[PDB]
Design a protein around this ligand. Sequence first.
Ligand SMILES: c1ccc2c(c1)ccc1ccccc12
Ligand SMILES: c1ccc2c(c1)ccc1ccccc12
Ligand SMILES: c1ccc2c(c1)ccc1ccccc12
Ligand code: FES
Ligand code: FES
Ligand code: FES
Ligand SMILES: [Fe+3]
Ligand SMILES: [Fe+3]
Ligand SMILES: [Fe+3]
Lengths: 192, 192, 192, 446, 446, 446
Amino acid sequence: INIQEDKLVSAHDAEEILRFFNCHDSALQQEATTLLTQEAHLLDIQAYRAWLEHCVGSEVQYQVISRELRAASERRYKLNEAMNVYNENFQQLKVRVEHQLDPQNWGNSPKLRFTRFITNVQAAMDVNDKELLHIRSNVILHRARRGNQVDVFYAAREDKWKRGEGGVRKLVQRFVDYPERILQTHNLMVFL
Amino acid sequence: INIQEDKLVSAHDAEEILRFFNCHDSALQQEATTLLTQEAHLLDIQAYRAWLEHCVGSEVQYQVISRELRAASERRYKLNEAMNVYNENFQQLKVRVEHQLDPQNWGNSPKLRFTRFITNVQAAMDVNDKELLHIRSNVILHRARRGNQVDVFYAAREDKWKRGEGGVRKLVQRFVDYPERILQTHNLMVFL
Amino acid sequence: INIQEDKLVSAHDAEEILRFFNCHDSALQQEATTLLTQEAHLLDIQAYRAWLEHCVGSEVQYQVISRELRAASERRYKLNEAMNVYNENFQQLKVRVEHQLDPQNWGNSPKLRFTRFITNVQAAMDVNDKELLHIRSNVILHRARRGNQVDVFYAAREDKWKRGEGGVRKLVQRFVDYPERILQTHNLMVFL
Amino acid sequence: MNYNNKILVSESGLSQKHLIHGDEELFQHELKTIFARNWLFLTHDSLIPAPGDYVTAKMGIDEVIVSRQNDGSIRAFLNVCRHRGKTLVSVEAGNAKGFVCSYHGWGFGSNGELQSVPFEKDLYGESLNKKCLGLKEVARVESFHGFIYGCFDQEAPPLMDYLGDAAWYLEPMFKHSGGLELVGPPGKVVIKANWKAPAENFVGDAYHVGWTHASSLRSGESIFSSLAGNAALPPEGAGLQMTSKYGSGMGVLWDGYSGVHSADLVPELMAFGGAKQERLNKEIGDVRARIYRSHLNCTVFPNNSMLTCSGVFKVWNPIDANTTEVWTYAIVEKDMPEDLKRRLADSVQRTVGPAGFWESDDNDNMETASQNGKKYQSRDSDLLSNLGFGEDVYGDAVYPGVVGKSAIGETSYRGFYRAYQAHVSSSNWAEFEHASSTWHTELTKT
Amino acid sequence: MNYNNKILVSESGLSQKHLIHGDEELFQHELKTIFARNWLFLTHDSLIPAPGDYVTAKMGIDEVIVSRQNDGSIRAFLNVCRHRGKTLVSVEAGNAKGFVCSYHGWGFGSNGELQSVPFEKDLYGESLNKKCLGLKEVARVESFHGFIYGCFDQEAPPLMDYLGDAAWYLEPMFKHSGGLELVGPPGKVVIKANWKAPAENFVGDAYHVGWTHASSLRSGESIFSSLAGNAALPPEGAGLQMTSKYGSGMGVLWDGYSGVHSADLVPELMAFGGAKQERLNKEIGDVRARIYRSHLNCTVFPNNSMLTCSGVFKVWNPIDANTTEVWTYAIVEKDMPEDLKRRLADSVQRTVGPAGFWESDDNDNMETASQNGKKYQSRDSDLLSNLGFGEDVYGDAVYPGVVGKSAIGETSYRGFYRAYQAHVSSSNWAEFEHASSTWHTELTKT
Amino acid sequence: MNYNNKILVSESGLSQKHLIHGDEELFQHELKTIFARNWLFLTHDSLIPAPGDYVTAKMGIDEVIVSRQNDGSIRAFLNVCRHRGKTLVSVEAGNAKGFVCSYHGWGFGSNGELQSVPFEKDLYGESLNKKCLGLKEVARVESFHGFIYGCFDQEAPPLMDYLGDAAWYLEPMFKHSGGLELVGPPGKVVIKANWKAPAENFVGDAYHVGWTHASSLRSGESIFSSLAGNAALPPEGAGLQMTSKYGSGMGVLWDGYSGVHSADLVPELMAFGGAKQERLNKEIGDVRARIYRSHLNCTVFPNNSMLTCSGVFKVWNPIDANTTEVWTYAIVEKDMPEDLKRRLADSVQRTVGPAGFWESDDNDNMETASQNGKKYQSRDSDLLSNLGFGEDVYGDAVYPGVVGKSAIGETSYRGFYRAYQAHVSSSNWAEFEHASSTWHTELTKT
Ligand SMILES: c1ccc2c(c1)ccc1ccccc12
Ligand SMILES: c1ccc2c(c1)ccc1ccccc12
Ligand SMILES: c1ccc2c(c1)ccc1ccccc12
Ligand code: FES
Ligand code: FES
Ligand code: FES
Ligand SMILES: [Fe+3]
Ligand SMILES: [Fe+3]
Ligand SMILES: [Fe+3]
């Protein structure tokens, strides 16, 4: 991709394409698929502690941004382009997990229902850190509660995963640029 | 998963996780993916007889429940927790298929359009019955009719499949706990 | 499938089932999955030129129809059953790509956000043309713009792909019969 | 629109303006003149049997908590905190001595009383009159053989009187059978129809069954299966229709004890019903014992319907003029074997529940008839309910109410809509009574 | 709002209150004063050519069945059963001798008559007057060279008179060309715009083309391509604008026979049109032969639009004040080769259909202009349509109607909105006529 | 409903009719009497610092462009083209000398003036009076220490006077701290609540914190963490409440400088605030220096809220009676280290932003209290705000306004709703003033 010719493509997005077009390792894509299906299963059943223990690395950065709408031709206005809906280290994720599990989290009675659909999985090893696995995937996340509340989230996830305790691959970075600027889902209180 | 620590996780859900985390058989996951993609294709084109003949075992239980909303802390109220939206044996599924195919099913003219998206496939052989295959998958089911009616269903499916006539693997149990308590899709008259 | 017995199934749909039930080539399904995941990634990042160059064959027919609602029992009325939402050769796709990239396409500022979910991939080589690959897949396509506009598209895609320049497999036919008769998404200005 | 003057329903209930299914101002007026005034179904003893057991229910668009008291009575309260109006209870059923609000922690008893206020002493001192801050109570709560109804209007007739001539028909099944249980929890589905469309269909509509349900009749092999596609009309004297002063009414299809149930339940049901009928002959007489095991399609005005024998129990909960939340329970006879009760409950949902293949046959009929009520050229058009008019009787020696001695007709539509119009044009129960002093004469004209 | 008094459109059509695109009470008032009163497009002969052929169409928010009769005439009926108001026909097109309702099985003929009632003898006896229960018929159905329009108001002018001075402009293409065919089925898409936004844009809006469609002009290489991004204004005398008593109007862009079509169709179209023009010179004169092959952007009041030569045919079907269901057909000349007809139809959809890249350029303009009509500080603001005011003529020796002899202006907006205001403030056709007795004088002031 | 007469808020602000959170006619009336009349938050200097910098903002349901002028002033204009009413600007922020409409290309300056019209000479000649076609300007735009507010009503009090007695409380943080910056861009989320529910909660609601946020208090380990689950009530004299003539008010929780922030920020914040307080003692006095580092939960009437020290800044943008678009910014002290500013901003969003775990605790409370306002049996019911009534003072020697010298009460609800009712029942500012001439006497009764 030449971003001078493909005028709509960001430098960041062009960099991520190259990562996956280069080398294809079918077995790695299958490892990534398993890892993400298992993570999604733990989250769907609300095993948030198990998720932290089995899927999330101690050095994690878990980040979901929302980008201000700017003119495609904007070249002068220079201030903060985005805010962090999530920008969490391990301890901050732990605070959120404890909030979910607290028996006085009144919002969680009656129990919520989550169903996640993970697709478009791509996996590539880092060029420089042979132990860092880049995984890209898309998620549809369905949250239903209180009879008639239904919220559906849609996102692309740029992850880095690395082998940790016991040789288990764990999430060390998730990055999501959330596609909808104004949320129409009451909140974004779901782990994408 | 320790459900005393992961306070939000049901005993049933914890049991199903263990099933798939234990052993991973990549070829089995691929067999399951094919079986479910083919089943979904037959259903999408409304080949309901072909579905019964090729995908559904004579001993099938096809069950979709709806669970009453109860307090997360509820320990005394003991009455029927759920109702059966579907709880069908082979003959009952056959009645439904005949209803779909009847030329005086006025609701089916003009012809409906179905599109199913099957994801998050996991497969594991039963521990005790070496011929019983446990398959878990999620479905988004899109039903469109009469110009502007569009209904989208979301669910996780816990299946058991077993080799039957001609060595063909067929569905012997499907269980869905439907995530939305009050349906906003006119009805649940779709085979999840 | 006997369409005299399975009364709801079209001759066309019955023909496509047979294609994939016959032979299963697991490696081919994996090649198709990669090809479609990469195509979807290029489109999601709006690399429309790269898409044309890497994914689309010079002899392409890119067709999306909308079929008039007719009685299931209709046997006399004989006029045009469908219209073409898309029916594009390479040059016509190029016109559309140039329209997307034009700096005076005011509708594209602020930049749109696309996220595609590709599922249910099936692949089979043509019987007669050993170099023609039939690929079937389903897409959920999420388009978000201008703060609170969100449009979600759902479709099944019947593709033919063939090796072209440099031995790269490229799309030579896409056919979609769009499931919703009246669009509720402002337009269908997305590449399914 | 002037509801005192506007003729929404013509004399004798013969026609209704189609706008009644679509007009949102009339819907709002119904909240006042129909739903806040009349008896509405809440729950059954079997769902809240023990002290502290509660469920939530809709009454019109309002939500109530329905709670078994320590003394065995049932009281119902608006599900709204008396402080700043938060919804108190977010679940459908449970057991509790009281309910605490999640906003500021006010604690209400199962009896509605404001029992505790966090830090009351420090904050309010002795100045908060908790005695005056109990939950808003549903004025009237009464039982018909375990079926619990509520009414917001203290002036309403007692539930028994309100059922009028319909009560005689329900008693064999509701009382003389030994009692019914409601099997929960209900299915819940939203349809794009006015609440009156399904209400009128259940109250009086045997005419549609052969044609609308052709596919379900043929596929399921049920006892009414010969009707499929209008292949056959019921015999001479195959049933009757009735209606009553306060709007409730039903069809009676003689002997149809297995109802909508597919052939897998027909033999066992027909045996069970016949066996109880034989015992009942001695107790309540042959005619009423037969009624016990005859299929009754009934609406308890306004928005509660049922099919006895089929075991279907419905609430058509109003949301707006073209939206209704359908609750579907099963009813079973207490003395049925438990395994039969379980299969019967499953069969109710199978046929008329959220994925009920019969109920699916009805959807487009209900939804489009309701939505057409909004369309400009249809608003002032007349929905016809004249079938059997001039052949109804009142005061018959055997069958009470305004009665059509034929299985298929629109008698029960006429009585339903006569009552509806009398309420819509009245400000209170006294005015309804005055507007209904010649109800049966109006219905039996010509 | 008092529609007799409220000035929604200023004198001479010079401005309109922005609320007209957002006010739901006015939308409801339009159902009465615009849609129930005026001529609305239904279908074409080419879509229902043979006896029994039918289509469904919208007329305002109502749905009608449009049926070819045995005698070759066309009649149209509300798609609503005369019994309990169910939608009779659920498909878009077909062939049938009649329509049976799926609720209770009432059978209506293609001629609207109630032809059968299931078990009529047993149930109704001789008492049902079927003669009085035919489907509600559309009072007026007329044809303009195969294009079939309906009107619910018996008092309306004949369609030809209703087209007024616009008819002269359409005739070369609609009549002298040998006839047009409508190619179906249409694209159908919902947009979040008031029906008047696209109607006004097609009637009169050449000004927007260069800027709004800059990207489509540049990408597609069409004949108007030099306008892209306001790089160029049309030459002196590149066209004209017109409007008429009953609100219909159009722009004329001289010689633009290939219209919006991309360069792949330009040579073949320009040849075909030029060839027919040469033959027509002898028959209808040079000016009118030229009009035949000139691009006309026209709205037939209220909500039917077209681009001749481009071959675009639109219905802007109203749903509410900020929702419209857009139907898009192609029109082709009958004597074009079949392969050209097919490519032309595809090109119409390609450019202005559901995925029409041109139409996409318009979406935000239409949607936001309509939605801003609801915003508090904009409701009482004035939409301007004064371009070219004081340069329009009436009664010109060559070009009839109120005419602006310039390619770009707002003449046709002014006549459209003059007619709109005259209807909105009138109770019937007589009052519209009285309000329009000086229509052309009002438009040609200053 | 007659807004001159209807008592929506009882004397002394002691109760409000629950319908105020649900009634759409009242919502429409609020657009006029609340939103078009009062001061509304737009942006901060820090977001449009340089000439040509602009943002879009809501003012009620209207959208405005807010632009830094060449002379350093700020002007605001409706985001609506003066031609046919298209939305001019489709982005949230940028830098431009002007804005061109995408429909017909009209070009407006950053100063609102119509600066160019495509082909003006050829089309309009000298006849278009561009001087009269500038964008509709927001009459009043004023700054409170960099925080920019707008008002559509020229008759409004100056912003400083409008803040009334609330200004004294905000000044230590807004002015004496050295200045605040707003960190953008905001989070934006739609909730199904009336704008007044979150507005009242921020203005006056310390009572809910222990119970509503029990889980967030316990999980995050913040300075207010001892309140979790009503385990503890604040000490004697832990804070106060105040309110003001024009409706703005706040709670003060002494010393709570780290606010909602989890234990990872508590030590650094408590040090930073304490250090600045020590310097401020000498400049503004001990009491006001302490106020600087005390947690203020404030609503600037009507729909702008904040938590100082926590650094939360909210706009509750109205959409309809049960829909609000929540904008969430962070505020930081200019002289904080940049790394602290960044972590503080992230922590604001973490706690109360789109995925704010604290804000999630509030959702059901806000949404159900608002939606219950539509339910028939609740419309005429009374929301209570009587906590602390008869213990408020006015004209205190140290703390100005109507003041409750207790940390938890409903003083600020009463002043908020007194102002609300005075506006709703008044046609202009003069009438509000007349209705408010005894405002503090009304609030301090009994
Ligand atoms: C007689 C028999 C069956 C029914 C009715 C009347 C009326 C409504 C209904 C609805 C569903 C199924 C059966 C019925
Ligand atoms: C002149 C030329 C093209 C157009 C119009 C007027 C008016 C509307 C329109 C809409 C789509 C495409 C082209 C046009
Ligand atoms: C005192 C302390 C915290 C809060 C309030 C009052 C009021 C509203 C609020 C909302 C979110 C978080 C904290 C608060
Ligand atoms: S709203 Fe229930 S305690 Fe305050
Ligand atoms: S509604 Fe059509 S036959 Fe009854
Ligand atoms: S609407 Fe803005 S220039 Fe015409
Ligand atoms: Fe039915
Ligand atoms: Fe256009
Ligand atoms: Fe809170």
